[PDB]
């Protein structure tokens, strides 16, 4: 097998900046070869695209700014100037001797400016009460960088059981995440406890961004 | 132009077995080698193996650890791609591609994906919640509302709101999998003034229990 190792994993860059994305092959035996390179752009609930075919020909609709190169084994994918719509993740591909194989993949970060989410809480709604369980939502959405913190306080105490987090891909338009947290309790303890709070740690703030609501207000 | 339209996916049982198509149309389907790639949740992709032209005897071919169980098929004279897997494995979940081999190998046009899970868990309907503000909640200019998808099998639901007319400030989030059940959650950000206002509804869909709710986002009262 020409076994394909891509590197790097992930890297970040900023708008207009220049991103590279490398792609190494293991070489095989028979004279009647003739293998190929071919890259791939896959963004979030999508099918890949293809960019570029055999190493550095550029594929008709893909703009100006992909560029393939490389000899041998190494093999290369140039991304300039970045644009917010390329945060996605890039695969190499070998086309020739048998299997087909692609390489392990590389998600590229948009940098953009630090922001702060926007996060609001949600009680539970009054039909999941009426079949014994209740869920409190949580909804950090619209920030970066992807790193991001969620405390459950249920009264004065804080509170690690049935905590369910979700978080999305870069946004394609702007360059932000967002971020669901689910707390689920029974019925009971939901009723035998009053205040509920959702705290949001996060870069762009010292302090972390608190909602809450208290259980008396239906 | 070229279309590749897939269709088949769903939950199956271990050991069991699935046919998967994929339609072709805006070019002479009988001249392309054609190809099945599968993609596990959060992760590579992975070659399954391609069928040849009827100048090449519907040469067939696949990657070593299917290559006993899976079957690529051609239907020229109807443009259509077949890929039946037998004996299922548990790994065997993935997203499933099919491709037309374009210029160098290279893969210039795919299906949009059709979702093949194997578990011996049960197809479940979701319970849809609203997830409205507090009542004791106060103003800021533009409002929050979501909805909670909750106990489901298998992936997918679709999620949209007002039957596609808030397209907007809309975070459907990826599912997660507890105890073989996935919980599932979208949030819509609207101008304040529009809601309560206005109506706001958010419409699920799981095709697997032919589940069909739709919820709209009500105030809050005593």
């Known amino acids: 097998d020409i076994v394909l190792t891509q590197s790097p994993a992930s890297l970040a860059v900023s708008l207009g900046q220049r991103a590279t994305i490398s792609c190494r092959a293991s070489k095989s035996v028979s004279s009647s070869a003739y293998s190929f390179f071919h890259w791939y752009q896959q963004k979030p609930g999508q099918p890949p695209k293809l960019l570029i075919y055999?190493?550095?020909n550029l594929q008709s609709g893909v703009p100006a700014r992909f560029s393939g190169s490389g000899s041998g084994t190494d093999f290369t994918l140039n991304i300039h100037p970045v644009e917010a719509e390329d945060a996605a993740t890039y695969y190499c591909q070998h086309s020739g001797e048998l299997p087909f194989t692609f390489g392990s993949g590389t998600k590229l970060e948009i940098k953009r400016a630090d922001a702060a989410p926007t996060v609001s809480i949600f009680p539970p709604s009054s039909e999941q009460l009426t079949s014994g369980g209740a869920s409190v939502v949580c909804f950090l959405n619209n920030f970066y960088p992807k790193d991001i913190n969620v405390k459950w306080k249920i009264d004065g105490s804080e509170r690690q059981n049935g905590v369910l987090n979700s978080w999305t891909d870069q946004d394609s338009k702007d360059s932000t995440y967002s971020m669901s947290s689910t707390l689920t309790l029974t019925k009971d303890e939901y009723e035998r406890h009053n205040s509920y709070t959702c705290e949001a740690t996060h870069k762009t703030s010292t302090s972390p961004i608190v909602k809450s609501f208290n259980r008396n207000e239906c | 132009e070229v279309q590749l339209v897939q269709s088949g996916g769903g939950l199956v049982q271990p050991k069991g077995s699935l046919k998967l198509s994929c339609a072709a149309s805006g070019f002479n389907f009988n001249t392309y080698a054609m190809h099945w790639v599968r993609q596990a949740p959060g992760k590579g992709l992975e070659w399954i193996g391609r069928i040849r032209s009827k100048s090449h005897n519907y040469a067939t071919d696949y990657a070593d650890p299917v290559k006993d169980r899976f079957t690529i098929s051609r239907d020229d004279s109807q443009g259509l791609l077949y890929l039946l897997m037998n004996n299922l494995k548990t790994e065997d979940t993935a997203m499933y591609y099919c491709m037309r081999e374009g210029i160098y190998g290279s893969f210039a046009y795919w299906g949009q994906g059709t979702l093949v899970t194997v578990s011996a868990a049960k197809t479940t309907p979701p319970s849809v919640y609203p997830l409205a503000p507090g009542s004791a909640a106060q103003t800021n200019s533009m409002v929050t509302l979501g909805c909670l998808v909750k106990g489901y099998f298998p992936e997918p639901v679709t999620v949209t709101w007002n039957s596609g007319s808030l397209s907007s400030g809309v975070h459907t989030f990826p599912a997660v999998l507890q105890s073989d059940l996935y919980t599932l959650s979208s949030s819509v950000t609207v101008p304040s003034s529009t809601w309560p206002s206005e109506t706001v509804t958010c419409n699920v869909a799981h095709p697997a229990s032919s589940t069909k709710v739709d919820k709209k986002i009500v105030p809050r009262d005593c």
């Open positions: 055999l190493a550095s």
